[PDB]
Amino acid sequence: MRCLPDGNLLQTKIHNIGATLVGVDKFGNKYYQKLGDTQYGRHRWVEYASKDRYNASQVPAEWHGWLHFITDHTGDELLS
Amino acid sequence: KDWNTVFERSINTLFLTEMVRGLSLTLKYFFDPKVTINYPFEKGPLSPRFRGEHALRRYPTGEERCIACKLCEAVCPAQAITIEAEEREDGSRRTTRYDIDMTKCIYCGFCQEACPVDAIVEGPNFEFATETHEELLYDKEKLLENGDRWETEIAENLRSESLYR
Amino acid sequence: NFTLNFGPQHPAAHGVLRLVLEMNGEVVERAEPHIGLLHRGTEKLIEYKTYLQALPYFDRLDYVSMMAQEHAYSLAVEKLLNCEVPLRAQYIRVLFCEITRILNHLLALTTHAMDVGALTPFLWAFEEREKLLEFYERVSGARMHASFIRPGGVAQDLPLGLCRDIDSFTQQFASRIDELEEMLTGNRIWKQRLVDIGTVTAQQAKDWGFSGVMLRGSGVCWDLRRAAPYDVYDQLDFDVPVGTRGDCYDRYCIRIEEMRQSLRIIVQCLNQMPSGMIKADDRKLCPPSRCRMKLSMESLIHHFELYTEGFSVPASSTYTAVEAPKGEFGVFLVSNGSNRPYRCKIRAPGFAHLQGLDFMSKHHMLADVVTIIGTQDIVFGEVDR
Amino acid sequence: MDNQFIFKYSWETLPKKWVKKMERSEHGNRFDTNTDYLFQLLCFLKLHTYTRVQVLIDICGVDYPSRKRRFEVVYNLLSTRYNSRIRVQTSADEVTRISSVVSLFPSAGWWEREVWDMFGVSFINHPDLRRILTDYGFEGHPLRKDFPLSGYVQVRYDDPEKRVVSEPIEMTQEFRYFDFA
Amino acid sequence: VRGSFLDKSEVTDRVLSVVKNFQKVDPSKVTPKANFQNDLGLDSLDSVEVVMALEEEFGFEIPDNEADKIQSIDLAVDFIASHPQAK
Amino acid sequence: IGVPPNSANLTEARRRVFDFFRAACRSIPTIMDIYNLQDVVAPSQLRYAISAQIRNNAHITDPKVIDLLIFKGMEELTDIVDHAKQRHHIIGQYVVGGKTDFLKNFYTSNYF
Amino acid sequence: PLLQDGPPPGGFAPVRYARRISNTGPSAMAMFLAVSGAFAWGMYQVGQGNKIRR
Amino acid sequence: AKVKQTTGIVGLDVVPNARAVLIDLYSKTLKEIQAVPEDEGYRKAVESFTRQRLNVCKEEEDWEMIEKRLGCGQVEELIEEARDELTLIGKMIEWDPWGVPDDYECEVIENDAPIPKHVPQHRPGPLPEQFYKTLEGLIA
Numbered sequence A: 001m002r003c004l005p006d007g008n009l010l011q012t013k014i015h016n017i018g019a020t021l022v023g024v025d026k027f028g029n030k031y032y033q034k035l036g037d038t039q040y041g042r043h044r045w046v047e048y049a050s051k052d053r054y055n056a057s058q059v060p061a062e063w064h065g066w067l068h069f070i071t072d073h074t075g076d077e078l079l080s
Numbered sequence B: 001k002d003w004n005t006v007f008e009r010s011i012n013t014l015f016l017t018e019m020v021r022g023l024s025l026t027l028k029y030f031f032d033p034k035v036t037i038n039y040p041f042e043k044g045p046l047s048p049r050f051r052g053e054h055a056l057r058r059y060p061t062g063e064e065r066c067i068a069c070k071l072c073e074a075v076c077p078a079q080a081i082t083i084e085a086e087e088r089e090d091g092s093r094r095t096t097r098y099d100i101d102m103t104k105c106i107y108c109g110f111c112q113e114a115c116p117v118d119a120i121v122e123g124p125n126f127e128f129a130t131e132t133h134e135e136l137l138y139d140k141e142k143l144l145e146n147g148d149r150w151e152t153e154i155a156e157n158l159r160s161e162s163l164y165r
Numbered sequence C: 001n002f003t004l005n006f007g008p009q010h011p012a013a014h015g016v017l018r019l020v021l022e023m024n025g026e027v028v029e030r031a032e033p034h035i036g037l038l039h040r041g042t043e044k045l046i047e048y049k050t051y052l053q054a055l056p057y058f059d060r061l062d063y064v065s066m067m068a069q070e071h072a073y074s075l076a077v078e079k080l081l082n083c084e085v086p087l088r089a090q091y092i093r094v095l096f097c098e099i100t101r102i103l104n105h106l107l108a109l110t111t112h113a114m115d116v117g118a119l120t121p122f123l124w125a126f127e128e129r130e131k132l133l134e135f136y137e138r139v140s141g142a143r144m145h146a147s148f149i150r151p152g153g154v155a156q157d158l159p160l161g162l163c164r165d166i167d168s169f170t171q172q173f174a175s176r177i178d179e180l181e182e183m184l185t186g187n188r189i190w191k192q193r194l195v196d197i198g199t200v201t202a203q204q205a206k207d208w209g210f211s212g213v214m215l216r217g218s219g220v221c222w223d224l225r226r227a228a229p230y231d232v233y234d235q236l237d238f239d240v241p242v243g244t245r246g247d248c249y250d251r252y253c254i255r256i257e258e259m260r261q262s263l264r265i266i267v268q269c270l271n272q273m274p275s276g277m278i279k280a281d282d283r284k285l286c287p288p289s290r291c292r293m294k295l296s297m298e299s300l301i302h303h304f305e306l307y308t309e310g311f312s313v314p315a316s317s318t319y320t321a322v323e324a325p326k327g328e329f330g331v332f333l334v335s336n337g338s339n340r341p342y343r344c345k346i347r348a349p350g351f352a353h354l355q356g357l358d359f360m361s362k363h364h365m366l367a368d369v370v371t372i373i374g375t376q377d378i379v380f381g382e383v384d385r
Numbered sequence D: 001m002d003n004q005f006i007f008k009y010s011w012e013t014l015p016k017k018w019v020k021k022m023e024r025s026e027h028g029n030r031f032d033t034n035t036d037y038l039f040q041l042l043c044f045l046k047l048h049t050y051t052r053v054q055v056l057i058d059i060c061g062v063d064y065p066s067r068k069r070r071f072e073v074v075y076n077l078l079s080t081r082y083n084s085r086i087r088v089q090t091s092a093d094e095v096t097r098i099s100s101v102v103s104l105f106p107s108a109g110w111w112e113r114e115v116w117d118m119f120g121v122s123f124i125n126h127p128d129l130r131r132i133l134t135d136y137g138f139e140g141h142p143l144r145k146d147f148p149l150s151g152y153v154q155v156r157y158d159d160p161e162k163r164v165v166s167e168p169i170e171m172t173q174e175f176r177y178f179d180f181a
Numbered sequence E: 001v002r003g004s005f006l007d008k009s010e011v012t013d014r015v016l017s018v019v020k021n022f023q024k025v026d027p028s029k030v031t032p033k034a035n036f037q038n039d040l041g042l043d044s045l046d047s048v049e050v051v052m053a054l055e056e057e058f059g060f061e062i063p064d065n066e067a068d069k070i071q072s073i074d075l076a077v078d079f080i081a082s083h084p085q086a087k
Numbered sequence F: 001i002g003v004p005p006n007s008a009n010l011t012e013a014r015r016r017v018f019d020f021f022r023a024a025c026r027s028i029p030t031i032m033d034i035y036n037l038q039d040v041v042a043p044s045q046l047r048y049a050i051s052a053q054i055r056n057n058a059h060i061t062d063p064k065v066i067d068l069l070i071f072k073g074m075e076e077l078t079d080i081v082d083h084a085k086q087r088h089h090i091i092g093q094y095v096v097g098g099k100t101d102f103l104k105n106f107y108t109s110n111y112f
Numbered sequence G: 001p002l003l004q005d006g007p008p009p010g011g012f013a014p015v016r017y018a019r020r021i022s023n024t025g026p027s028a029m030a031m032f033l034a035v036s037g038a039f040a041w042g043m044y045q046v047g048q049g050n051k052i053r054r
Numbered sequence H: 001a002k003v004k005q006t007t008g009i010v011g012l013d014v015v016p017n018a019r020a021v022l023i024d025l026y027s028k029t030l031k032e033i034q035a036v037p038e039d040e041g042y043r044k045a046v047e048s049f050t051r052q053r054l055n056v057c058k059e060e061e062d063w064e065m066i067e068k069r070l071g072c073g074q075v076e077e078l079i080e081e082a083r084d085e086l087t088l089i090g091k092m093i094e095w096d097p098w099g100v101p102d103d104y105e106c107e108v109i110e111n112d113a114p115i116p117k118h119v120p121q122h123r124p125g126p127l128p129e130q131f132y133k134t135l136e137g138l139i140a
């Protein structure tokens, strides 16, 4: 139902189609990648656990580097 | 000059031909994919060198790295750092006050370069907008909190960047 | 004659532009710019900083051409210290100078186009700007104020794979310029807005201290990269475009061609880039590596001195100028033997250019004033300091 | 047309009373003139066939409080015809007006206004000599060595008067001077 | 009927009051023939002040070369009573 | 129009002083409307203020110092008229509209 | 260390910097003939439609 | 022999009778310089290069060869210099700056501190032979 008022979330749902789940963090945020080349091969995004009241600061440090393409290690590999 | 070349420009002017190409090339990107990032679900790329929110670090034992040398305070081009120090009860040379005015700071990274023990660093965080001026007067406890929160990413960037500095 | 007060408090025209125009109907008789709205006392502040602490101030003068002013300040300090810069640093400095020139021309050409009603090119160009800003961030960690070019070389070496990414940008950028040209060059509205507007003769350009595109538009072959070359510019091939009419339309074409020639230099710099050190090795102004500072007593002492007191510059004075994107950018540096500059006078090309608005806009229409300001490529950070 | 030729040619052809000092160096050829000859010397350099110094790059002041003539006015000039640069300097104090060269180089107009604003040096025959950089009603010349870095006054909005007002400065943290000498 | 000049006696009076009210002018030496410098103890800066005080009271600007031939009360009254711009 | 040469002697300088006094004082009605001082101060009180500033420098004998003072006076005047910064009880530098002085200062602070 | 970012063996591929031409567009006479013929035939059609409407 | 279409310099018009104009200007200059004292270095210098340029203009009737031999820009640029030199001569007569004062003192500094190769440096190259001929004539 959140897709109707929140068009930002709808864009993620459409682009989630066919993506690979990479991991889930301690807050429940889900991390997806496509492995294509559309914006120069950058296809990493996060589906926040809270469908409302989501915030960019909710991404933990172990997944922050992966999300911003600073590192290729996922949050799971950094925690290990 | 010549009736053909006179006719050539007269028709080109009347029929607005050069404005046809302008329309044609404006339409080609219409059906092409867009470059817009779906913030905040998607983010722009950054490097391990990115100069963002400051953080104070500790050793893996929990001891502070900072030894109150005041090199970062001396080099800071904006005079954004204020430090007080004295000998700790166990004899250690430690700060009792470490303040960074995030509103004076110019995010140059000179403090990180000056520090001899890798205590002060500019982390990867750039999303820390506040509703009050006061919250941007970072004290020692806030900076050590930032280091605790971002330690795993900071240590990874430091390992990657160690081969260059 | 009535007086039309025009201050756009928004970056439609520079944000702090303030013009008092005397008009006869819609025809301008006198244009008087009021400046100092961004006067920040940079030259006074520099006197209270060490030579290292003063470097970030030069990023914020012409904030569209950051690394170019970094380069001029470093060259002036190197001139007074007689400091040898290694060859790899020279190529890197030239490479990012040309990247900065494209970044500048892309903003100057499309903000000008946006002001005369062409809204699409700005979006197409700022996307190319984002790719180039990414190269700034990968070498320095900052999108704009890199503080990457320093006396004696550059702060750090290039990250692995950056050169390949730069090469990928060069393989497609010519098409991006071609698209910008097709939207503007042949269009009859664009020509009608620019042709025979703001005509500057060669004598007028010399009289008013014009430089850069403002001087070469008037047919004067003058480019400091060839007249007084620096770094590795004498080992590179590039042509110097010159105008034949001295109007806003010529200077538009020159900036397009300068972007093409800048692409030419970057490609040569990428292929000729030699290996080696990127800092000068005189242990007087170059910071030691993190590993030696933590292992050698002499390196730790040098690191302590460089970040507290800085280096001293023997008492002397000189003027150093480079070919910045907006024209000749100069620094008159006076040293008194100490670790802080005694006097640092900044010569901004936009200071001379905006002073020429009065004679350039004489007897034009009100809507041509913005076009002439756009062809001058004014940034008030350097005008006001 | 290197710096050796200009130094040697100028000594032979210039009137002797115009130059007090001549320096040849890799930091730039430099003629030190008296105040009353500055205008004529610059006119000679601009018009003469063998110099053709057509471009006035900038004019700047330097403060030397230990000198009886504290101010030094530096003229940086360029000859595109011969691809050479020349520096001409002169001294001044807080009350000696000096000649304006706007009639020789129109670009001098704003630079002379800046010298007056920043240092307090006045220019005879300047068409429109007023402050150009500082706020309106500014007191003092900030580039003087004795002028404090943060100045004397600051501004803020005052709700009871419904306007921005100027008051004497009050810093939360004063500027810390670090003496590394 | 419309007039184009202030009455002489009315001017004599307005000028007499202006000169007296100016401080350093005791209302004892102020005669219609009294001279500013020689007989009133007013120096050059005080003397120029009186003349422009006549400009404010009568609302018109006196050309300087006339402001100088006004060294006394006759010369000032002779001038204002014949100047049309006086109101 | 242009900045004149330095006055040769004290007659020239004092002549320039009177032109400045005339020009500055003639602009009082413009200043009165700009700062709305009709119910605040009389025109004569501001005239006497300018005269007082001139008299306080009557001891200067160097004509070059007098020339600089007049030039700064014209600039102060121009900024007051052209770009007014209206406070309430001041214009520019000038306020508009049983114990000795030691105890008052002593009660205030230790810095005199 | 001993590995620095730089060119590959042989250098990068050549890149173009000069403007590329493009010959797209009809001719003065072609578009003139089209307009003239459309005008003539269409006005004849207007006459026919006016006759049927009447 | 072909007429020049453009000088390529904005605001610099083509002068088709350039040789004639130069001859007139140089002849005028050589006559007005005599009001300057003979011993003055400015008088000797002006006479030295004006005479040589006048000689080249008289010998060569083709403006392309006048530019080639003289090596100083176009003839239109040469004319500007000749006009400026005439203007400067008149101003020096008015100024009367000649003669050395009684207590004349001049300080010459020759600072030999080097600068790095990579910093900006003007290197114009060799002048035409006549410039060095004027200089050694002045010294002797």
Ligand SMILES: CCCCCCCCCCCC(=O)SCCNC(=O)CCNC(=O)[C@H](O)C(C)(C)COP(=O)(O)O
Pocket: E043, E044, E045, E046, F013, F014, F017, F024, F050, F053, F054, F055, F057, F058, F059, F060, F061, F066, F069, F070, F073, F076, F077, F080
């Ligand atoms: C609205 C306000 C805007 C304008 C601001 C005003 C700023 C004023 C400050 C600058 C003006 C000066 O002080 S200018 C300095 C004026 N002082 C002198 O001229 C020195 C020589 N003294 C004399 O000539 C006489 O003592 C004298 C009594 C003056 C007359 O002469 P008499 O003895 O024969 O009457």
Ligand code: SF4
Pocket: B072, B075, B076, B077, B078, B079, B080, B081, B100, B104, B105, B106, B107, B108, B109, B110, B111, B112
């Ligand atoms: S980033 Fe720069 S300005 Fe900010 S605290 Fe560090 S040294 Fe100071």
Ligand code: SF4
Pocket: B065, B066, B067, B068, B069, B070, B071, B072, B073, B083, B114, B115, B116, B117, B118, B119, B120
């Ligand atoms: S953060 Fe580093 S440089 Fe700053 S006082 Fe602590 S140890 Fe010294």
